[PDB]
Amino acid sequence: IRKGVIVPCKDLLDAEEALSRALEVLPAVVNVAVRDAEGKNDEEILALIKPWVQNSKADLLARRVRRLTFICGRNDGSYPSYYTFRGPDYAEDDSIRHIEPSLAFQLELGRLSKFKLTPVFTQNKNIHVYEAVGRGVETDRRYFTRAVVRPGRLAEYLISEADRVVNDIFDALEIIGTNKTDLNHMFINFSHTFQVTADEVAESLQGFLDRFGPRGWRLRVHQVEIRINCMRSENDTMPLRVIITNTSGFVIQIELYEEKLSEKGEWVYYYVSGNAKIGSMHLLPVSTPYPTKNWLQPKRYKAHILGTQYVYDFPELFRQAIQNSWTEAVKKIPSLAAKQPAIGECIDYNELVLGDQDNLAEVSREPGMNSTGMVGWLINARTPEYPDGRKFIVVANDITFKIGSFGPKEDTFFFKCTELARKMGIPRIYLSANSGARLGLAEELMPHFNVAWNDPAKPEAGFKYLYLSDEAKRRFENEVITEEIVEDGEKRHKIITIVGAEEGLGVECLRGSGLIAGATSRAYNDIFTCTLVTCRSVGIGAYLVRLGQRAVQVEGQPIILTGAPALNSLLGREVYTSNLQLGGTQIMYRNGVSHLTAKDDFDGVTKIVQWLSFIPDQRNNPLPILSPSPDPWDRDVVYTPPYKQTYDVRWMIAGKEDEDGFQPGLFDKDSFVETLGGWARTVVVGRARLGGIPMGVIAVETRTIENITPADPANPDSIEQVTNEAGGVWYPNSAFKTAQAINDFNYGEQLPLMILANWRGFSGGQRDMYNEVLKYGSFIVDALTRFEKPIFIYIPPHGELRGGSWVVVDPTINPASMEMYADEEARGGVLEPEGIIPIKYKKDKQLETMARLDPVYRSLKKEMAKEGLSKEESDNIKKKMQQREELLLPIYHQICVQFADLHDRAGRMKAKGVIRQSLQWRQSRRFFYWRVRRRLIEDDILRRIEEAINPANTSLAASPETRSPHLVQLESWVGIPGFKTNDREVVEWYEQNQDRINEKLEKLKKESIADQMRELXXXXXXXXXXXX
């Protein structure tokens, strides 16, 4: 136990004899008092106590006594002076002076850890001022004041006491001077258990701070901390710590906290303040080290040498991406820019940190100070699409915090974030910069474990096992699983399994990794999911990129699974030279793991805030539609594709740039955003807007694209393979791209789909067949049946939809949400007109029609039929016809081709009812604007009808005009004659009679509630339920 020593000497010289002889009662802490209040000795009293300690440097050391105090009682009421020597050599800590060690704890100081401290002279022994300069950067220079109060009087005592103590601090800061100080702080600790409560003390707080405030502003004082107690709650204390900061020339910052244990073993800052909970510092330890200026700079640099922004710099990257989002929209849409919220107030974020019962809590604290290798925020961004506000979650790893590795704490956090984004419906964005899961060994068992050899003299003769000494075995026991086996007559505890105290070494990390891997897989299908490769995303991190589906890769950041050197070691030779040689953009964007490639960390954010513009703010919320604004809805589609040559299909979607002017596409000018344009370029996937209505687009590339698969370095006998993916055909990769895109616009994104169908089938070739073309063909069908929002399959001019292709895109796949249209000059059959001709219109069938239309051939036929001509005569008719038919054959072939093409024509399609309407490409925009809008408002009204009615397809005939059995009831409530058609008239009706539908829904809701009540021996049960 720490033995207490107290000795009251009479003199300074005679005090030495009560040291060397008083230490003899020690087989700890020692105090020495004096009776010479003659002079207020300083420095010379320090040169009068140092000779007694440097001489007995081994005397105090041997007894193992830690602290040595020197109290000096003054006869005028003066607070006695105390001097303490601590440690091995007892160097005398200048920090604890003129105050008892018990008071040290009360003085704090463990909060000025990130500072070089040098104290200064104080006229009042109670107050202590310190010069503080940031350990790293010298630009920071501050004066911290530390005062502790304890009474001498046997109600409004404390408020009058406060005036005396703060005036004393102000008068001392005056003599030391304001000098050159960036910030100044003062702490006033109260030892008192006063019976009163902070609510009245806050009213009185306001009173004296406005008087002292002006003076405090001059000294350059930024904040003051008062630490009082309130015994009336039980009559158990409520320690109320209060911080008052002078931010903006006027205080207006009174943060009223409460000292409570977080359950985790730390005392935290739980505030019940009056600055409207949107302030600083909440559920933070009392041990926070008052950070310096530029304290973020070392961490910033560490992230920047890895080529990534420091994690806490990302919220401001998002503010500027939104800032840019308005500056560009005010250009395109002038006037309607009045809702711009300035440079600040763009976004309104709040940190997320694991709560008391591990339930995420919204905190607004200092950047940095992250307890775990992961951080999150709930951001309310005022986008021009949702100018009132829109929320989303942003999760990211701290690449400085243990190279950003995934430990169990990091996992539980990431999870509880995904869990929240789901619970709110708001999208989730992950900023990846990690090092997979955490590795680790038990460090404590490294300098303690023993080895049992076969031969102790020559250890190279193999070792039997590894054991632990009995004294070192009792030290752990729960950190190691040991078996006892006596060898050489020793109690040897052989290590049979190592556990280790510390977490995050092995399997505990894999378990958590698996949890979040599944959580991300689940989330993708519910809320909008997105990832960003801001830096190397390895192992589990690499998978959350794929489970997160929608990924953006910064050019020089790899999505690696197994380390580039780890692979070289496995092969035994230096095959791979870079982590990007197998993880980089040239792999992931070129195989479709990456949807977009961004030049830098900000370019990434920018591109993300771009997808979020297309996506509804919540889960089941209406799309971010705007006024027609740049490209009006009432404009005709100018670019029309040629029938001769090939065309960049992109020109049909947004528009073609030309020498003379610009011919627009069917979507809004430059609203198209192509994704996965590095993988299976035979299909163009992207998002675009149609008169303000955002929607998903899939189109077919007509030009013969060539993907060149790279050479494998692992096999020196591997060369790059030149493969030409001929345009307008479906290949394993193209099919996969299509299918993926569909599910991506389906889950979370919730977008209507536009499919400019132009494929002439599937790749039936041996190589493509073996490459599972059939597997990925199915994936399109599977994906289409899962969809909910409207899908429009529109065959464009020149566009084809032959056999294999048509089957996997037909509206009877999902009749409830699909709608098929075909262009007036489009074609669609079972086979190409060049392909049917050698099956239904063979050589013999063409000659029967030749001996019908051609006059020469049927006249020569009349010669053979009449007979009466010899062997040399019949040869003439044969050599006359088999010359005529030889020259007619090429044009007669083309006749059947045109004949067969008249079957494949659009008209036939409407006649057999496989399409709704024939469409003129010129006015496609004008038609789809009102058909997309009509379907979107109607789909929801029907969804609402069903939700009111039931609180819980069948034929080739199924056409969208009957997609729901309620479209008959809604038809009669509306009253429009041309209901199935006149899309514009319908939309405008709903908009006007918004109140009449909600009138009819409530009528139906009360009617459906009456059915459920009635559906609920049975009579006896009901009687009993009535009695209850």
Side-chain angles (χ1 to χ4, degrees):
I1 57 106
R2 290 175 192 174
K3 286 149 74 70
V5 190
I6 285 118
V7 46
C9 271
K10 56 166 197 75
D11 200 61
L12 298 168
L13 196 98
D14 194 52
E16 197 281 317
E17 282 184 42
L19 183 142
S20 50
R21 231 164 282 104
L23 272 155
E24 283 165 28
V25 204
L26 296 171
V29 279
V30 51
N31 302 260
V32 189
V34 180
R35 291 163 202 168
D36 47 49
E38 39 195 25
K40 259 250 279 174
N41 288 355
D42 66 288
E43 178 210 22
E44 274 279 17
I45 202 132
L46 293 168
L48 193 55
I49 60 164
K50 281 182 187 184
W52 316 141
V53 80
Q54 63 178 246
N55 196 57
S56 72
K57 245 184 176 181
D59 205 338
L60 301 146
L61 179 65
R63 319 293 202 272
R64 286 203 178 187
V65 53
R66 200 162 280 188
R67 282 170 172 174
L68 159 69
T69 325
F70 287 104
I71 175 171
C72 171
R74 248 172 267 296
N75 59 304
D76 350 294
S78 304
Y79 197 96
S81 182
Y82 307 89
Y83 316 92
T84 325
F85 294 79
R86 200 213 293 180
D89 299 304
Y90 312 97
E92 199 282 324
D93 57 279
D94 42 43
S95 313
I96 306 304
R97 287 272 282 271
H98 301 80
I99 278 268
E100 192 58 4
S102 298
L103 297 167
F105 305 84
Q106 296 177 22
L107 192 81
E108 201 36 70
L109 291 192
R111 286 197 82 180
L112 303 167
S113 316
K114 195 40 188 63
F115 289 107
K116 282 176 182 176
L117 62 291
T118 45
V120 64
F121 158 76
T122 57
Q123 66 304 321
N124 197 40
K125 316 267 192 145
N126 304 98
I127 62 154
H128 315 265
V129 203
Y130 310 93
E131 199 192 89
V133 164
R135 289 184 86 209
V137 77
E138 286 299 286
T139 184
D140 198 16
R141 191 176 169 264
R142 297 175 200 162
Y143 287 129
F144 283 93
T145 320
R146 298 284 175 158
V148 63
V149 72
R150 268 179 21 106
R153 147 78 173 160
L154 282 147
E156 282 178 353
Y157 158 84
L158 296 166
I159 56 106
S160 181
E161 262 285 86
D163 305 325
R164 194 199 105 269
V165 66
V166 80
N167 203 89
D168 275 333
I169 289 158
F170 273 39
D171 292 4
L173 283 163
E174 200 73 74
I175 54 105
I176 291 141
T178 182
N179 296 32
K180 247 276 183 188
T181 45
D182 308 290
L183 297 172
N184 295 297
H185 166 90
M186 57 178 85
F187 178 70
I188 301 99
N189 203 321
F190 280 68
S191 196
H192 222 258
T193 334
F194 213 88
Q195 232 218 357
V196 76
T197 33
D199 60 275
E200 54 245 76
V201 186
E203 189 274 295
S204 229
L205 185 85
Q206 175 261 310
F208 43 65
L209 63 89
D210 52 62
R211 326 175 306 197
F212 288 103
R215 272 209 236 178
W217 178 253
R218 281 134 203 172
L219 294 163
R220 303 174 200 189
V221 179
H222 199 269
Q223 62 176 80
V224 49
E225 205 171 36
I226 318 283
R227 196 213 157 270
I228 190 164
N229 285 64
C230 289
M231 212 171 190
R232 217 182 154 220
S233 50
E234 284 169 14
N235 294 274
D236 269 302
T237 34
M238 284 189 139
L240 273 306
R241 198 178 280 213
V242 63
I243 307 162
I244 298 105
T245 83
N246 197 316
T247 176
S248 308
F250 305 95
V251 176
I252 200 80
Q253 206 93 212
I254 53 165
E255 292 150 298
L256 189 268
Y257 294 79
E258 198 260 325
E259 279 167 55
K260 209 254 171 185
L261 63 90
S262 60
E263 270 188 286
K264 274 179 81 265
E266 304 145 24
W267 284 76
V268 290
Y269 279 53
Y270 187 78
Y271 70 76
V272 199
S273 73
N275 72 321
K277 278 171 176 169
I278 313 149
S280 169
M281 208 159 298
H282 185 70
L283 290 161
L284 271 66
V286 58
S287 59
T288 64
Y290 291 105
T292 60
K293 189 178 181 183
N294 275 144
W295 76 297
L296 302 146
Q297 201 60 38
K299 285 177 99 181
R300 235 163 226 160
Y301 175 76
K302 281 172 187 174
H304 287 321
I305 56 130
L306 293 157
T308 173
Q309 304 296 309
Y310 170 74
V311 200
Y312 283 90
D313 293 312
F314 272 94
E316 225 286 325
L317 282 174
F318 272 90
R319 178 182 263 96
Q320 267 183 276
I322 291 165
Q323 204 179 310
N324 286 354
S325 184
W326 286 79
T327 61
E328 253 292 285
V330 299
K331 289 185 205 286
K332 293 195 201 69
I333 311 99
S335 280
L336 306 155
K339 281 199 181 185
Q340 204 174 330
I343 295 113
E345 278 274 87
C346 277
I347 68 150
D348 291 303
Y349 66 107
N350 276 325
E351 266 173 81
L352 301 163
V353 166
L354 277 157
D356 283 353
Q357 261 145 25
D358 266 41
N359 300 300
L360 243 57
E362 235 186 319
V363 49
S364 191
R365 74 189 192 195
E366 259 288 285
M369 298 165 132
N370 51 306
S371 53
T372 56
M374 277 276 313
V375 175
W377 307 264
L378 164 68
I379 304 137
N380 183 77
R382 296 113 185 269
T383 207
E385 297 77 53
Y386 300 97
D388 275 281
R390 83 176 288 161
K391 286 136 173 284
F392 56 85
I393 300 302
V394 164
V395 287
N397 356 54
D398 186 19
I399 194 86
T400 76
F401 195 115
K402 301 183 181 193
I403 40 143
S405 57
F406 281 103
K409 278 184 109 189
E410 287 69 21
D411 296 324
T412 309
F413 182 84
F414 183 93
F415 174 88
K416 275 278 160 182
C417 274
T418 283
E419 192 204 68
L420 170 73
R422 289 270 301 281
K423 190 252 153 203
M424 280 176 160
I426 54 157
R428 181 235 71 177
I429 312 151
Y430 173 48
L431 286 51
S432 203
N434 56 80
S435 309
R438 294 192 164 140
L439 279 97
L441 258 62
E443 324 282 312
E444 60 272 349
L445 285 137
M446 295 193 193
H448 290 77
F449 87 104
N450 290 99
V451 192
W453 299 271
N454 171 264
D455 177 62
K458 290 168 100 284
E460 68 260 41
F463 65 102
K464 296 167 184 177
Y465 52 82
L466 302 172
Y467 74 99
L468 196 57
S469 181
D470 188 29
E471 288 182 349
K473 186 252 172 190
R474 273 127 43 178
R475 282 180 202 263
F476 309 108
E477 268 166 24
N478 40 48
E479 286 157 270
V480 176
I481 305 160
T482 56
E483 204 171 85
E484 199 277 332
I485 186 83
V486 287
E487 185 202 339
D488 194 25
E490 298 293 293
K491 196 187 179 186
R492 301 197 169 184
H493 296 91
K494 60 139 78 184
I495 319 133
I496 188 134
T497 298
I498 289 163
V499 179
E502 59 277 75
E503 292 295 314
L505 311 162
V507 283
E508 56 267 62
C509 291
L510 301 162
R511 173 99 169 174
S513 292
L515 179 62
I516 54 158
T520 312
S521 166
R522 292 190 283 278
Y524 158 67
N525 295 304
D526 183 285
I527 54 128
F528 175 96
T529 205
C530 199
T531 42
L532 162 79
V533 199
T534 179
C535 198
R536 51 131 179 181
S537 191
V538 209
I540 164 66
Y543 268 111
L544 304 169
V545 172
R546 185 55 183 165
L547 296 148
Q549 279 295 329
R550 306 175 254 256
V552 195
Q553 192 175 24
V554 182
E555 311 285 18
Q557 320 302 336
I559 310 156
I560 180 158
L561 252 189
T562 314
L567 294 152
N568 296 345
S569 61
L570 199 111
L571 284 146
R573 54 183 197 98
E574 289 307 295
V575 170
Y576 307 124
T577 60
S578 175
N579 292 60
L580 266 112
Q581 209 187 297
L582 58 115
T585 46
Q586 70 271 26
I587 296 110
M588 302 309 156
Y589 185 51
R590 263 211 75 214
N591 75 9
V593 169
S594 304
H595 287 58
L596 289 178
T597 57
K599 287 182 87 182
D600 50 63
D601 299 309
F602 175 73
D603 190 18
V605 179
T606 294
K607 274 151 174 270
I608 290 160
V609 187
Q610 197 180 53
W611 286 43
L612 296 168
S613 90
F614 294 95
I615 305 319
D617 59 323
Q618 241 170 57
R619 212 200 290 95
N620 291 286
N621 256 25
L623 284 134
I625 312 131
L626 295 166
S627 299
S629 302
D631 223 358
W633 74 264
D634 200 12
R635 72 138 180 103
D636 43 347
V637 192
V638 187
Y639 183 71
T640 188
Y643 278 61
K644 263 184 184 195
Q645 295 119 15
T646 46
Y647 51 93
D648 183 35
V649 190
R650 274 89 140 174
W651 299 327
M652 285 175 76
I653 308 149
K656 187 190 179 177
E657 192 44 60
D658 210 76
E659 149 69 28
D660 268 290
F662 161 79
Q663 36 210 115
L666 80 310
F667 287 100
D668 299 14
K669 186 195 173 180
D670 310 319
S671 68
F672 187 59
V673 299
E674 194 197 345
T675 63
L676 307 113
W679 170 58
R681 289 164 252 103
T682 322
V683 51
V684 188
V685 168
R687 294 134 198 94
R689 278 189 173 85
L690 180 94
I693 316 166
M695 69 193 293
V697 188
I698 299 163
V700 199
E701 180 53 270
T702 55
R703 309 172 288 179
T704 55
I705 61 121
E706 56 164 75
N707 88 272
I708 324 300
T709 57
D712 186 29
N715 176 220
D717 314 85
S718 279
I719 193 77
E720 298 178 339
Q721 278 304 119
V722 47
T723 38
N724 307 288
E725 299 177 65
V729 196
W730 249 318
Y731 295 87
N733 49 311
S734 307
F736 204 150
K737 197 185 169 178
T738 313
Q740 178 115 143
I742 298 156
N743 291 324
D744 290 8
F745 312 142
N746 179 30
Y747 302 115
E749 282 207 333
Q750 282 185 29
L751 286 149
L753 232 169
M754 178 53 70
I755 297 125
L756 298 175
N758 198 346
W759 313 257
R760 65 199 79 111
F762 280 91
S763 195
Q766 194 207 262
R767 184 189 45 83
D768 289 292
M769 282 282 242
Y770 179 91
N771 289 355
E772 293 141 64
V773 59
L774 216 77
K775 287 206 186 202
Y776 308 113
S778 298
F779 284 26
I780 308 157
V781 178
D782 291 291
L784 290 177
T785 297
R786 275 141 191 186
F787 222 102
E788 284 165 57
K789 293 227 164 171
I791 306 119
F792 313 103
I793 305 102
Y794 172 53
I795 314 170
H798 177 85
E800 309 153 359
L801 211 67
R802 306 282 190 266
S805 184
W806 190 295
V807 164
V808 305
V809 285
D810 190 81
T812 61
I813 294 161
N814 193 347
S817 60
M818 288 182 205
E819 214 161 83
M820 199 182 173
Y821 295 112
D823 192 272
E824 281 176 52
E825 279 284 34
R827 307 280 172 260
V830 159
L831 196 53
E832 183 178 353
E834 200 58 81
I836 323 148
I837 178 175
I839 301 154
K840 254 71 196 170
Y841 232 131
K842 277 115 162 177
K843 184 204 95 290
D844 65 282
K845 296 148 182 76
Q846 294 183 78
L847 287 153
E848 281 169 282
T849 322
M850 190 184 291
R852 211 261 286 178
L853 252 312
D854 188 74
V856 187
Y857 201 81
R858 62 167 137 87
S859 295
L860 280 153
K861 190 172 174 180
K862 281 192 173 186
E863 298 183 321
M864 216 77 195
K866 278 173 184 187
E867 207 208 85
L869 288 165
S870 301
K871 52 108 200 40
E872 271 169 350
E873 309 284 274
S874 67
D875 271 319
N876 303 339
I877 312 123
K878 195 138 194 166
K879 291 159 204 173
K880 280 160 195 171
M881 289 173 90
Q882 286 173 3
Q883 288 300 295
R884 181 69 185 157
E885 71 185 41
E886 287 192 320
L887 301 156
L888 286 161
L889 174 64
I891 197 75
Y892 256 92
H893 168 95
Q894 215 193 286
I895 285 153
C896 290
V897 173
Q898 160 77 356
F899 173 81
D901 191 65
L902 292 148
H903 295 68
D904 290 349
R905 241 92 169 189
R908 196 272 202 289
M909 295 158 76
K910 201 165 179 169
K912 287 283 194 241
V914 302
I915 53 141
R916 254 41 70 197
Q917 284 160 275
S918 61
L919 259 76
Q920 197 161 127
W921 175 253
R922 277 211 140 91
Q923 302 232 7
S924 283
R925 181 158 169 87
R926 293 210 181 91
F927 170 71
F928 287 120
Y929 179 67
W930 296 91
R931 187 54 110 144
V932 188
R933 183 177 289 272
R934 183 189 121 92
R935 239 185 163 279
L936 283 166
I937 304 174
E938 226 159 280
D939 257 308
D940 178 78
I941 291 157
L942 295 146
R943 286 174 220 239
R944 293 171 73 182
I945 283 157
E946 187 64 25
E947 276 168 69
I949 292 187
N950 305 299
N953 147 51
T954 316
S955 196
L956 277 95
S959 282
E961 283 75 36
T962 55
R963 72 192 134 120
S964 166
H966 302 301
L967 275 183
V968 197
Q969 291 191 83
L970 182 55
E971 206 267 316
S972 57
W973 299 343
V974 168
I976 285 164
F979 180 65
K980 288 93 194 161
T981 176
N982 291 324
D983 307 337
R984 188 193 209 269
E985 197 185 0
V986 176
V987 170
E988 293 177 341
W989 185 85
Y990 293 140
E991 278 159 10
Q992 193 256 293
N993 287 280
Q994 179 75 237
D995 287 339
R996 203 189 172 259
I997 48 132
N998 299 335
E999 170 211 79
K1000 294 229 176 180
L1001 284 155
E1002 247 187 86
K1003 284 175 187 178
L1004 228 45
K1005 235 182 202 116
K1006 289 162 199 174
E1007 275 167 70
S1008 89
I1009 289 167
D1011 301 313
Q1012 291 167 280
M1013 283 154 80
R1014 278 189 176 210
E1015 279 177 11
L1016 292 171

